[PDB]
């Protein structure tokens, strides 16, 4: 499988002298770090959140990010003042693993406006024109440019390889779905609920014998709080037609033995 590693920063500025920056880190759909505004240190949410990095290497990366966080905050409030509140900024930075590609995207007020690409920061077509000046200034700083290039080209994929080794048990865990049926002139909506499965890929279908019911309407994948997934699939049926229907669930954890529940 091809994992996406993403570091997500969320910065809110309410006025001068109020902002917070909170970050979370995800490897695929498993959280590996949290870094709260009021916490000085990055918090591990897995045993293996350090990957293969040494205590010394990690400690200095933490300190580097600590200075980034303070620096970022001061620069945005300056940028705003040198030119309205409230301001929301989001950064999504990480790498997608095949080989791998890296990304660093920035959104302002909920909208994608800037990426780092190759060796420089670039505004995206349609971004506000006032960004051109500060981005040109940011691009004048070769230190940060080289530092970002190193983080994206080298450090990200390197770090993620270590995470995959160190987190193998959790990353490759199998948890079984448990399913149940419920239902809400004459027409009925049958609901097949499937909860507690991991990993995410799953197959759920209403069946009449070996015939798939094409009215099966799959909902979105919803998270449980215990790093498992929830999904439901509905079927609208006329009165009487309910007889003979089944919900069939296929999942990697089930060893080839599908769940079939009969309405």
């Amino acid at each position: 499988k091809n994992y996406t590693f993403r570091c997500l920063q969320m910065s809110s500025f309410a006025n001068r002298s109020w902002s917070r920056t909170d970050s979370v880190v995800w490897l695929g759909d498993l959280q590996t770090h949290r870094w709260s505004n009021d916490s000085a240190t990055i918090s591990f949410t897995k045993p293996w959140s350090q990957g293969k990095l040494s205590n010394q290497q990690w400690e200095k990366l933490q300190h580097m990010f600590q200075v980034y966080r303070v620096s970022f905050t001061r620069d945005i409030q300056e940028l705003v003042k040198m030119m309205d509140y409230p301001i929301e900024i989001q950064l999504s930075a990480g790498c997608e693993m095949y080989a791998s590609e890296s990304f660093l995207h920035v959104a302002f007020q909920g909208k994608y406006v800037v990426r780092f690409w190759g060796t420089s920061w670039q505004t995206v077509p349609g971004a506000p024109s006032w960004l051109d000046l500060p981005i040109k200034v940011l691009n004048a700083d070769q230190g940060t440019s080289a530092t970002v290039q190193m983080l994206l080209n080298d450090t990200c994929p390197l770090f993620v390889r270590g995470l995959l080794e160190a987190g193998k048990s959790d990353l490759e865990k199998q948890e079984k779905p448990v399913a149940w049926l419920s239902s809400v002139d004459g027409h009925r909506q049958l609901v097949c609920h499937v909860s507690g499965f991991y990993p995410k890929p799953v197959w759920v279908m209403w069946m009449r014998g070996d015939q798939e019911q094409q009215g099966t309407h799959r909902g979105d994948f919803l998270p449980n709080a215990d790093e498992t997934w929830y999904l439901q699939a509905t079927l609208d049926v006329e009165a009487g037609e309910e007889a003979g229907l089944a919900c069939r669930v296929k999942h990697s954890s089930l060893g080839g033995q599908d769940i079939i529940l009969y309405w």
């Binding site: 200095k60 980034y68 620096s71 200034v137 530092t147």
Partner: peptide, 16 residues
């Protein structure tokens, strides 16, 4: 300017 971040990246270039 982005003054502080530029000062950050200049100090933590040497570590990386």
């Amino acid at each position: 300017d982005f003054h502080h971040i530029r000062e950050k990246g200049n100090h933590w270039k040497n570590f990386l």
